[PDB]
Amino acid sequence: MIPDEEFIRREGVPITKEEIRAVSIGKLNLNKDDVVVDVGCGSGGMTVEIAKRCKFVYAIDYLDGAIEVTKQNLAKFNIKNCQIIKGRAEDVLDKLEFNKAFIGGTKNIEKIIEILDKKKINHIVANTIVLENAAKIINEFESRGYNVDAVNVFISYAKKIPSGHMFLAKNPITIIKAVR
Amino acid sequence: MIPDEEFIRREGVPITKEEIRAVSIGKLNLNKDDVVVDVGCGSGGMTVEIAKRCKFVYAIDYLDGAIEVTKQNLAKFNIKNCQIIKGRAEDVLDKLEFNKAFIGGTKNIEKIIEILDKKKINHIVANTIVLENAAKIINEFESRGYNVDAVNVFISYAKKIPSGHMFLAKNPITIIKAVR
Numbered sequence: 614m615i616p617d618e619e620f621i622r623r624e625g626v627p628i629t630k631e632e633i634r635a636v637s638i639g640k641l642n643l644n645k646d647d648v649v650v651d652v653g654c655g656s657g658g659m660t661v662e663i664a665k666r667c668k669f670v671y672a673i674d675y676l677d678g679a680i681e682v683t684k685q686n687l688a689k690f691n692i693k694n695c696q697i698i699k700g701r702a703e704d705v706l707d708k709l710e711f712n713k714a715f716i717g718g719t720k721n722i723e724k725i726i727e728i729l730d731k732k733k734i735n736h737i738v739a740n741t742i743v744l745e746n747a748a749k750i751i752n753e754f755e756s757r758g759y760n761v762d763a764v765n766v767f768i769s770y771a772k773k774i775p776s777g778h779m780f781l782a783k784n785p786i787t788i789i790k791a792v793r
Numbered sequence: 794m795i796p797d798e799e800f801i802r803r804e805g806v807p808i809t810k811e812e813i814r815a816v817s818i819g820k821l822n823l824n825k826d827d828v829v830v831d832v833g834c835g836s837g838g839m840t841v842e843i844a845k846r847c848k849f850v851y852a853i854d855y856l857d858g859a860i861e862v863t864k865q866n867l868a869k870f871n872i873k874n875c876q877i878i879k880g881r882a883e884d885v886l887d888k889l890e891f892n893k894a895f896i897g898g899t900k901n902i903e904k905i906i907e908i909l910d911k912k913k914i915n916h917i918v919a920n921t922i923v924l925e926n927a928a929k930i931i932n933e934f935e936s937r938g939y940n941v942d943a944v945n946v947f948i949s950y951a952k953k954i955p956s957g958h959m960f961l962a963k964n965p966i967t968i969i970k971a972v973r
Contacts, residue, residue: 614822615819615822616822631819632816632819632946634819635816635818635819636816639794639795642797755953763950763958764812764949764950765948765949765960767947768944768947769944770942770944771931771941778931778943
């Protein structure tokens with residue numbers, strides 16, 4: 614499944630649009646034995662979709678608002694597959710046993726990627742709207758022996774205006790898949 | 794799990810990109826009870842992905858190349874709830890029973906839309922790269938009481954080169970969902 618209007622949102626807290634999560638989910642190639650860390654503090658959209666397809670998910674979020682909404686969404690789809698961990702991913706990550714990672718939002722991508730790598734995490738998906746990060750992540754992963762597959766995705770949404778349908782875009786996003 | 798690129802390809806026969814399939818599969822909102830028609834002469838990417846998800850799928854295709862590749866992929870991924878019906882959708886669709894349509898390329902998109910309309914199909918997703926067809930699909934449907942969520946997706950792929958990476962553009966495609 615997937616839908617977007619059936620997610621509990623909250624001003625100040627971002628949510629991945631449906632089409633983006635559909636692509637990002639696919640890149641993770643999730644199965645029943647995957648234990649996934651989901652970094653970067655959002656509303657829970659990706660968390661739920663990941664929870665629904667794997668063994669267990671850690672949602673690492675560092676801001677209160679995000680934790681709260683994710684929590685509500687978790688409640689809302691009856692997810693018992695998931696632990697929300699408040700804090701910096703770089704402080705937490707060492708302590709966990711997992712085999713895949715999705716990274717959204719996040720600070721210290723350079724720290725996280727290095728920890729991921731040395732924890733022998735051999736399948737990672739990262740989304741970024743930022744040019745410098747897209748550049749970092751792709752080169753960081755290729756140097757650390759991953760084969761990298763990145764796509765820039767620019768979605769625009771039909772909106773009716775007096776003359777007909779215009780397409781409303783906001784920001785393109787880079788979705789990066791590193792497997793090793 | 795949207796499959797990588799383990800698809801049987803035969804050149805002259807297009808394959809819908811992985812990320813475009815993930816978005817279209819998402820907009821279809823598949824249930825195990827869905828009976829889907831899949832109209833479009835491609836390599837079976839979409840077909841397969843629809844089959845894994847619903848009770849049954851009918852691939853409607855006029856093009857021999859397309860059919861055979863599609864048969865091969867269906868074979869490759871062990872898909873058994875799918876029947877291929879060789880013919881022009883405009884000739885056949887009106888005979889079929891199903892409650893959900895996916896439309897890929899097709900000549901005579903008006904006729905097709907008329908048919909889905911009459912049959913009271915409450916859920917249609919259509920991909921097009923043709924300007925005029927995107928216009929007709931959206932307006933024809935909005936005219937018939939469907940509400941229509943259309944998106945345009947521009948995808949580009951990082952390609953490694955001596956200086957770094959460039960992004961090679963693929964052609965943009967409009968993904969139209971119509972629900973009533």
